[PDB]
Amino acid sequence: YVDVGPDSVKSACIEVDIQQTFFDKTWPRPIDVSKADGIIYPQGRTYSNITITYQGLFPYQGDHGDMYVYSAGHATGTTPQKLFVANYSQDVKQFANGFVVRIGAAANSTGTVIISPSTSATIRKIYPAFMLGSSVGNFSDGKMGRFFNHTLVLLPDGCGTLLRAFYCILEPRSGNHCPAGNSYTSFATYHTPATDCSDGNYNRNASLNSFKEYFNLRNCTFMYTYNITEDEILEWFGITQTAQGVHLFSSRYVDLYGGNMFQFATLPVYDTIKYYSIIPHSIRSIQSDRKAWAAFYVYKLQPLTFLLDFSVDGYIRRAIDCGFNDLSQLHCSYESFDVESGVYSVSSFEAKPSGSVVEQAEGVECDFSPLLSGTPPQVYNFKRLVFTNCNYNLTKLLSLFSVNDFTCSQISPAAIASNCYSSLILDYFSYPLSMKSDLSVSSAGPISQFNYKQSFSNPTCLILATVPHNLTTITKPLKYSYINKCSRFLSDDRTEVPQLVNANQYSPCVSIVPSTVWEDGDYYRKQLSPLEGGGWLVASGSTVAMTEQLQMGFGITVQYGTDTNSVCPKLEFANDTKIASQLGNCVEYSLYGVSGRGVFQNCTAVGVRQQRFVYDAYQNLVGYYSDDGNYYCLRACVSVPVSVIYDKETKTHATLFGSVACEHISSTMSQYSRSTRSMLKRRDSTYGPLQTPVGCVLGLVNSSLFVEDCKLPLGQSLCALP
Amino acid sequence: PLKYSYINKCSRFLSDDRTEVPQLVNANQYSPCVSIVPSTVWEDGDYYRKQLSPLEGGGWLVASGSTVAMTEQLQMGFGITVQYGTDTNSVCPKLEFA
Fold this sequence. Notes:
part of a larger assembly, 2 chains, 722 residues, 6 helices, viral protein, Immunogen, peplomer, viral spike, MERS
């Protein structure tokens, strides 16, 4: 492994107080794509001043990003105090094909200290620290953001002029305020300007030393270092991951002024990254020497395509996010940054999805009603009902009795009610509660030995319960009974062999024992034929007095199909929204396995009735006969055409929604055809939609002027002045 | 190795303990089950499970594997792939230019 050097000796750490409410600030930074903000230069190639389309990962143009700020820790007088930091350590983020950042953007300006904002200190660039890896979870104190196995460490050391990278296993420390300790709050790292960054000795290990105070490096597999120099100019940086491993990008090495990112470095690690977090950092400087720091930003990559305006000097200077709005699509369609004026078609609205409507056969029902009448059998004589291909609700069945024992082996008692199975089998018998200690598949008692047993090849279960006073069709035995002996005497009339009951089967002795045992300790015998090898069947039984309500026991077993699980607990919209119909909009549907999306309406009937599905010559479903006896018809769904008026001379635009009319038009769209409508809103935030003979429009204005040729006619007598 | 071995299962059980969904390996990447599976499979048909946190979306990770007897001389396999770049094409056969 890599020689990173020794773990700091003390296990102790500086206390970290979370002050996150102090850090709420509003400084958003949308991407200025016309300035090529955030653009990663294409790999390995260059071009002349020709514009080209390109596809690759890019930040979304409209995203204002995630913003964060590093700050000084607490200090008073001339000395340090415990750290005050933002809660960014708790902010686990999902990795999503990499990210890019902006660094130092507030340089040559002023702001406030934030943690002690009254100071109004000027603000400057700090290089960020980050951690990446394949898994996250709770710290032993339940704290957010612990990472597992090896993780990436992107850590600057001391001044921004030194950068280091690592792939290594962190180990928790048991000192006060540290990760294995229970005095831990949150992880942080720090820099101390009193000795760090001396101008005669920059402290090359400074950030690492404070990093080591919270974690012991272990099993390290990689380390790297880089040389950086100070520059107040804004920088871009970012990370991607490929099957060739992780790569690092920066604008600093190649394009200080144009800002185009280039692959600054690469890393040997190709282990997939699933998560990302920002490591908090703080300044340990004297209270009057504290300095405010610049806002920093993060944006997420997406598989976008763009126009790129290469400069003759090969830097990309301008770009168009094709999918941001319809105008951007128009430019991409013509592969240019200057479309000639005209009216142009753009893609239609998708309309919108709505909640589903489904109709399928229901009510299969599950045989169970035999349990509710007559006298139940003695436990050795239990009755069985086998169920396949049908619908049930065991918890409804069990609410007909008061349950005094609900247990199973190899399934939870709750899960067997809620799981589909290929079959469901129920055994039932009368059974006194006085014998309940002897009812288990594992019991030492005579009930498990000779009366009832259940297989361990399936997840069976048992139940004890009693009958409510309103179940008057149930009747009870004179005494509860069971077999307490069952053996066969061997034919030599001295040797004897016990006959424990077979799983899921009647004992052989049930054939000699009477349907109930008349008295406690009654016994019977049967001579066996020479075909049996001779001998005598021998059996005996015992009883419990009858009670004011019948007491009962049950056995349940199931078989789970691999793909044959027919028996399920279907409900006919119990505890549900009753989605058998809507009338109506455009919500996806399924009708006996036929599916599509559309609007239903209560129309008239057409034949042939009871063929269910009416179709046209193109096989579009026309309509459907519901099991409520009503014909409904289907128009599927519709879309809204859109077009745009483009005035290149003023570089302005307005829109037309066509035939749809302004009743369905609103200031924003819930449907939707493009990621934004905001380019219309630049002037149309102040105006209502206007209705015209061709269709509803936005930003058109009723001037009622008469002009012979507007160069942008909308057809008809509509005309459209610049 | 003592035995040659491999993973023959890697799926996540649904939190309701009935439904289960397979996790097929990504091209050119380790399967996610490697975090719980032992460096070699100690016995044919060994399997392991991990409860998953609500942060993980719930359920149980489930994985299993199989083994093959060792041989007198080691047997090996290789996968080889190449990448064409544009200005990064620095890997070549030794030059014949002399």
